[PDB]
Amino acid sequence: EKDYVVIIGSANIDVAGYSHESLNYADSNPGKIKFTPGGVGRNIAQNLALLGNKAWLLSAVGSDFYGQSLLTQTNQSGVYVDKCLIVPGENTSSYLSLLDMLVAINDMNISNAITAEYLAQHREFIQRAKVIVADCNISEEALAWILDNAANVPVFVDPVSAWKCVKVRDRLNQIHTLKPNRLEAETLSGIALSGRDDVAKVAAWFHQHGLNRLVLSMGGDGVYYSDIRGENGWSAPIKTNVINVTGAGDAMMAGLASCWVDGMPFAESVRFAQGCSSMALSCEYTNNPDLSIANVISLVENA
């Protein structure tokens, strides 16, 4: 109610291929192919809407049925998408994935339709939000715009990929919270993360470059959280049986931002976000439709 979250990210059409028993590179093996809504920013937005947050998605889609399906379904998930960009002439971004996991391919060129001018057309709206969530799928110039014209509003940035997260390197002094993985953080810092011993030096590198809060996900080991103010620590993983690994980081980011707007401490926010990730893990769907604050709180309580 007058408090909202703006997400500038990508909205993709996800094509997922599953094969019966084990799948090997040779021969055509029958299985299940799914067309599901996707895109880091879109997923984060949907999960935020599911967490009882007024989420506004600022993405770019095409004039094809894929785009309209994305927009309609996303709006139907409680996400305000009236300010989204529909580009007439270009194609909706796509993501092909062989899950279980083999190589993932992404055809995302409409993400560059999200421009400085487009965001500038929605200035003040972005500047009057509680939190701004951006992903590294957009253009470097757009990220620059958001970070420079945030107007003292915290910007939470999702790295998405290791080759796409360098765009915020020279700009870490403008990011409120980065959640990279091992490969991503190794890529950014240049320091090897070959252990649980080597995360202090990476965190130190990030803080020396101006990063306020770092949420480094180190698989098995857990999630290492660090604040530039001196607050460092480790968080243990919440025991869960996997079904689909897709959507973990998105649920984490949604949780983190929702917990920031809820006036929650860093560590507690890390546990809660880990709970959202855990709920994402337990679902076959990219986005758990039953994802709620109550369920996540129950999960962190009972574990």
Ligand X SMILES: O=c1[nH]cc([C@@H]2O[C@H](CO)[C@@H](O)[C@H]2O)c(=O)[nH]1
**Subset of residues 136 to 155 that bind its own copies, contact rule: CB under 8 A:** 140, 150-153
The sign of the torsion formed by the CA atoms of 173, 45, 261, 132 equals positive
Neighbours of 164 (CB within 10 A): 20
Which member of 62, 67, 154, 249 binds ligand X (CB under 6 A)? 249
Nearer to its own copies, 32 or 267 (CB): 32
Residue 12 binding ligand X, by CB under 6 A = yes
Rounded to whole angstroms, the Cα distance separating 82 from 80 reads: 6
Cβ 218 vs Cβ 199: under 8 Å: yes
Size of the site for its own copies (CB under 8 A): 104
Taking a C-beta distance cutoff of 8 angstroms, is the pair 299, 273 a contact? no
Q: Is 14 in the site for ligand X (CB under 6 A)?
A: yes
Identify the residue among 100, 120, 173, 243 touching its own copies (CB under 8 A). 173
> Does 160 help bind ligand X (rule: CB under 6 A)?
yes
Beta bridge partners of 135: 158
Nearest approach in angstroms of CB 231 to ligand X is: 28
Nearest distance from C-beta of residue 29 to ligand X, angstroms: 9
**Nearest residue to ligand X on Cβ basis:** 38
Q: Which one, of 51, 81, 115, 107, lies nearest residue 264 by Cα?
A: 51
Q: CB under 5 to 8 A by kind: which of ligand X, its own copies, none does 242 bind?
A: none
* Cβ atoms 99, 118 nearer than 8 A: no
Position among 106, 189, 226, 258 found at the interface with ligand X (CB under 6 A): 106
Instruction: Choose the binding region for ligand X from 10-18, 71-79, 216-224, 236-244 (rule: CB under 6 A).
Output: 10-18
60-119: contacts with its own copies (CB under 8 A): 63-69, 71-72, 75, 80-91, 94-96, 98, 102-109
Q: Which residue shows structure tokens 């403008």?
A: 174
CB of 47 to its own copies, least distance (A): 19
Binding residues with ligand X: total (CB under 6 A): 19
Q: Say if residue 175 is exposed, middle or buried (CB neighbours under 10 Å; 0-12, 13-18, 19+).
A: buried
Residues ≥6 apart with Cβ < 8 Å to 187: 162, 163, 165, 166
CB closer to its own copies out of 192 and 267 = 192
**Which CB atom, from 161 or from 288, has the smaller least distance to ligand X?**
161
Does 43 engage in binding with ligand X (CB under 6 A)? yes
Alpha helices in the chain (DSSP H): 40-50, 65-76, 116-120, 140-148, 182-189, 199-208, 248-261, 266-281, 293-301
Return the number of the residue (113 or 287) whose C-beta is nearest its own copies.
Answer: 113
Cβ neighbours for 151, distance < 8 A, ≥ 6 positions apart:
127
Residues at the site binding ligand X, with contacts judged by CB under 6 A: 10, 12, 14, 28, 38-40, 43, 95, 106, 108, 137, 160-161, 246-247, 249-250, 286
